[PDB]
Symmetry: C4
Amino acid sequence: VPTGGDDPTKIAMLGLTFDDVLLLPAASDVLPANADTSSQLTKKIRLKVPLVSSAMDTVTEARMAIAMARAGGMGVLHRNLPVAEQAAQVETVKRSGGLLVGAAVGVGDDAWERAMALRDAGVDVLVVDTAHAHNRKVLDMVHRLKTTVGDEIEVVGGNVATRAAAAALVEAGADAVKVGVGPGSICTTRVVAGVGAPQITAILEAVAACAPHGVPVIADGGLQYSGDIAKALAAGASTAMLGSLLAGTAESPGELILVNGKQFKSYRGMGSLGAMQVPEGIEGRVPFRGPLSTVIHQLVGGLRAAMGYTGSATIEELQQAQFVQITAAG
Amino acid sequence: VPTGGDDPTKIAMLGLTFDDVLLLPAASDVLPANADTSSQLTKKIRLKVPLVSSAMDTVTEARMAIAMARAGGMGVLHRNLPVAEQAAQVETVKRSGGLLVGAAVGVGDDAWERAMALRDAGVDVLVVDTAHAHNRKVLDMVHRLKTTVGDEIEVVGGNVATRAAAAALVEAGADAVKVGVGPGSICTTRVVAGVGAPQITAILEAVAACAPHGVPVIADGGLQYSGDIAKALAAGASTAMLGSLLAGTAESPGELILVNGKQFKSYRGMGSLGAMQVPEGIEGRVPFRGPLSTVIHQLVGGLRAAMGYTGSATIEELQQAQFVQITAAG
Amino acid sequence: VPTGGDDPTKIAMLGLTFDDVLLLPAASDVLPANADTSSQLTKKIRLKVPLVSSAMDTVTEARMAIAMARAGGMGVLHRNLPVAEQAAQVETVKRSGGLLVGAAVGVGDDAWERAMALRDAGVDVLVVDTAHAHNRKVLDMVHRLKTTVGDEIEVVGGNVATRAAAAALVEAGADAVKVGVGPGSICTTRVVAGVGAPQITAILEAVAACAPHGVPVIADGGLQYSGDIAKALAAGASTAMLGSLLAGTAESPGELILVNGKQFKSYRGMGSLGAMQVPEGIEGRVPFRGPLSTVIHQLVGGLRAAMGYTGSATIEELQQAQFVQITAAG
Amino acid sequence: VPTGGDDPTKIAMLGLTFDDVLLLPAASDVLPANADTSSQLTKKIRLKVPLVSSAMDTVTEARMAIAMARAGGMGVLHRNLPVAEQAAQVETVKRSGGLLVGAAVGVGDDAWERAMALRDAGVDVLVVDTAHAHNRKVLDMVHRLKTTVGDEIEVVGGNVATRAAAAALVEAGADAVKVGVGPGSICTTRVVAGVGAPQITAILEAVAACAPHGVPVIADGGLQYSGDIAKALAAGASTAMLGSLLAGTAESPGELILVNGKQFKSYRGMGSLGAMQVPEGIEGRVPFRGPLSTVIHQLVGGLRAAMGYTGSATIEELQQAQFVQITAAG
Ligand SMILES: COc1ccc(CC(=O)N2CCN(S(=O)(=O)c3cccc4cnccc34)CC2)c(OC)c1
Ligand SMILES: COc1ccc(CC(=O)N2CCN(S(=O)(=O)c3cccc4cnccc34)CC2)c(OC)c1
Ligand SMILES: COc1ccc(CC(=O)N2CCN(S(=O)(=O)c3cccc4cnccc34)CC2)c(OC)c1
Ligand SMILES: COc1ccc(CC(=O)N2CCN(S(=O)(=O)c3cccc4cnccc34)CC2)c(OC)c1
Ligand SMILES: O=c1[nH]cnc2c1ncn2[C@@H]1O[C@H](COP(=O)(O)O)[C@@H](O)[C@H]1O
Ligand SMILES: O=c1[nH]cnc2c1ncn2[C@@H]1O[C@H](COP(=O)(O)O)[C@@H](O)[C@H]1O
Ligand SMILES: O=c1[nH]cnc2c1ncn2[C@@H]1O[C@H](COP(=O)(O)O)[C@@H](O)[C@H]1O
Ligand SMILES: O=c1[nH]cnc2c1ncn2[C@@H]1O[C@H](COP(=O)(O)O)[C@@H](O)[C@H]1O
């Protein structure tokens, strides 16, 4: 084996991240303005815009969830707060008209009660929210939820970064599989644990397990530009979950921060010291970006442009687009 | 598939940019001073110097087109202005003696009238000027022009970055095919849409469709050094179109700008906010470089040196030269 | 041969370093808190924590060796001092309770006497401490020690970076093989001699020679993050030796240094001018990191997290984990 | 073809530079202090140290040639000065005892007279000094010299970067072949002409043509560290020619330059504007490094260390050593 040892499987793959690829233009009669950006969030739920906001306490509370739904996407309410408060945020969103909303739950002792209070509050999507879903406890929680409240509520499981893990979630009954172990902008799992999977390869592998079962893949983490959304969807994802790209918006939690004459907002991992109070996330800042509506417009604008270049009339068509791999120089 | 999924065609190629390759020296009895730098701009038009200036409003108006033609190249007048003004710039150039000149047209509602006014003004080359020529409207415009005024005017179509797109333009009747989707120095399509094709690979692919039909390829975008011109031509292109490399010259539109004691000129994408007034270009600055004549001398000087090292007596010979691929370290 | 010449073996392999790979998550029912971090230092000695401190005079004297042993690892006392002083440091450590301790010896004229004084002082591990163990003198020293005092003392040999060198040490009787030629943070062998071997590949190759004989591999040098420890062990190493990561701790030799309002400690190669008084190491500084106990907690915390993600209940299981290779972009 | 087009030979090879490889350690009983560093400069001339100084006017005049010869290497006197002055510098060197000296000649109108005046002055080596030796005029000059004065004077030809070019020089009668097109530290040929060949691959290819005919290869350009000398020789070169590494020494031409409290000397390409008065070199500065004797000691010290690690008792043995290819991360 050229990289060492005698086992070809020790280094199992070459992992590509968003920056490693570009979408190839293709024959097109699709105008960006006329592309259909709708896509499946879950088996049953289709969004007008294929974007959801991260379940993080510097990204999504009621104000963000409301704005996301109004923009045609959805918010996933974070779970770093008491059960009654999270359920009350669900109520606040559903009060704002017929708006879709999701909410994160863990697999700990209080997770089941949290999920039931969220169901009672009228949540549409429960996101079983972990860093490693390939685990009997996580799979059992997914299955239990789907068998208990699965007629009225869609159940997302995550996160995974391998084909086998995605397959396990599908088998457990997941209505969507969320992909991303290590790619988050505020993630230090890569350096702390030495664990991760570049996101283009992780999406390609997850989709290989999920698409044949009609289960949509949510690409979660590592998206830095509007172009990354197009790349994630072309790799086979049905939606993208965004943290950093939405953390600078007016609707995110947190105050404005002024440093060196420029405006920022705090953005922190849910595995950072501050969020937990061995951290696997940092506490950082992102530039202030203004109203969510405007950020989403620009992001969807880039997606539309990609659909124009690739001749993709729908997201389903975009999922069939081809990449070129680029070098460091490119 | 080593990079993920089960489809070998999902990642269709490995795309090289100019910085990924160098020209290999070869047996040579050609002195740089004695090389023949002439090359086909179109099927019928041969330039003394294989360089054309970008159809941009911070690069080519009448003054630049005149200087380019006098230097042995050609200018393509930009189309970000009323039809009567563009046609009047064509008249200004043709007034300066028997000078070649080209002009850009779109495929919008006013494009046909623009093209006819340009024909009436005595233009030699019409450039159907788009970001994505693999499109029925663009192909139809190319064909219509070629069938209507194609006896007296040469019709360039662009831009493309794939073999199939180049093939479609050839079939539509293009007299030259312009290659470049995403490589421009002021381009943000790569980040905004996630779309592009590294330019060496894009030229190799386009030439594979165009050369067998005797249709010249114009390499447009991404050329940063005189050496890139040699590389583009060796990859099979017949001419190169330059924006950034010519934007700093006295003959380009725009005022001198002084920042931190150094001189610059404004250089902006035609897809930037300022040019359009979701942008796919930026508004920037390039160092002031002095008279066009001197910049072209240096650029052709580098090309001549390359022809010396590779034993290329003509451009046609240079198109047969070989590359070495280099690593990040090199 | 694509990279030149006609000999495919001239460039013998593609060497990967820690930054070239990530651990892939795998099915897991292992909680980080419950993983077993114990591992073989030598054929006979098992540590609670798979970490040893470098035999360097800015890393390990008695204070560090005591703290390392108490944390469940071990210190290797450096040999840049008189024999009586080194032996006295061994005595100081053994005085602090039943604590494991190792000590470095060379292969020079005074090396045998040094090793016997260390044996008399009650050392548990002798580390034949060289930059190139594939050498008859080093192999002979290893063998002599193992045949003379090998019933009561374990003999480590190093350093190596190839399969053949590791094999030679095994055959000489080594109880453990230490791997690392050129990767140290303060190493300049790579630039001075042009010699080295990227550490993931070097570990994979050494383990291929050592594991089939039940000889543990110590990964020495190049570990910058807690995640690198997990990577080294997954590549097949049984323990990791750390210099830079432990040099900033309270227990390391040397004074606190204040520059630009921040705290540092001196950290220098044993091949630096200052340590020797043609240098193959530099004299540098590392940030002050506080008590050893806390640094080890964080490092083991990262290892535990990796064992969680990879479903490794023990180190032996972690040694079977798989990598993904990443690009420069990732 | 994965990188574009249908011609596998268009991109002829993957070129490696010094930074792309490291020497693998090997079984060794060679102490650095006892290695034999002698090597063939030409078919007939063997140096004690395998290093020659560049024929540049900021590197080698009489003072440098004398110091190089005394250190066991050789200087090649530059040719950017009148014939009588260059010949007089040869006389100055031969006056300093039995010291080897070389001198550059071109292939221009005054080149033959220059070569004869140098022969009359007692030169030992004539270096036919060009940027592209694969040319009938250069090959003819080499042959003419070898047939005219080749009994008493050794004739070096260069520079080349391909197997075919090296083969042509061998056939012309070269006593040594000098390799390097584009790698020099002050070289801009790569950017100006887009022409070059990474030096490890260029040496491997040249050696493949030269070694079977017993013609030594001189590695010229791109050597930044003492370790690069070992790498060049292991790739098959017999000696290395150094410019930048020797330009900072007391014996180089030029004054001391003080900028920002640090000492420098001027170092400029022979293709820079200043040396010629379309430039293919820059005018720069290198740190002042003190006496040549000390720089050579450090450089040979690194070479010796490499011979120690690779078990090379002689240079001839070092030429058989193996590389590992490294990634950007390494
Ligand atoms: C098999 O048993 C296990 C397996 C794994 C863990 C780790 C774990 O649960 N956490 C808590 C969540 N974070 S995170 O906030 O930083 C995070 C949040 C969402 C997405 C992530 C994606 N990649 C990295 C971190 C992510 C990481 C550490 C575990 O802990 C008990 C037990
Ligand atoms: C299939 O239907 C489509 C397909 C594509 C588009 C995009 C489009 O027409 N534009 C306007 C031109 N720009 S540009 O100025 O930035 C530009 C100018 C020239 C060369 C370029 C090369 N690569 C990138 C940008 C370039 C990009 C956006 C579209 O819009 C209606 C409709
Ligand atoms: C075959 O004969 C030989 C072979 C090799 C050597 C070199 C040698 O012994 N030394 C002394 C030790 N250093 S070091 O302190 O920098 C060092 C310390 C530990 C680990 C290292 C890992 N990689 C690099 C340097 C390392 C390098 C130079 C030699 O010298 C007489 C004789
Ligand atoms: C086939 O006919 C030819 C072919 C080639 C040339 C170029 C040429 O002779 N020169 C003059 C020498 N320089 S240089 O000083 O910069 C130089 C000096 C030594 C080593 C070099 C290695 N790589 C780059 C530059 C180098 C480059 C330009 C030519 O000119 C008439 C005619
Ligand atoms: O602390 C953390 N460490 C690692 N990943 C995190 C952490 N907090 C949230 N995440 C994940 O990172 C995603 C946001 O990634 P981003 O959009 O690149 O900033 C989130 O949706 C989570 O999946
Ligand atoms: O706004 C823009 N975005 C992307 N490409 C542009 C834009 N404006 C012009 N171009 C293209 O970029 C080329 C100039 O590239 P440059 O020489 O690298 O600066 C032009 O000839 C166009 O093909
Ligand atoms: O001077 C030196 N040059 C090269 N390697 C050294 C030197 N001193 C110690 N080492 C090795 O570098 C290791 C520490 O590497 P680090 O943890 O990356 O700093 C040590 O355990 C030695 O194996
Ligand atoms: O102006 C120049 N342009 C390109 N190469 C040059 C020039 N002048 C000298 N050289 C070559 O560069 C070598 C020195 O390379 P260096 O040791 O990397 O600085 C010289 O021996 C020449 O072969």
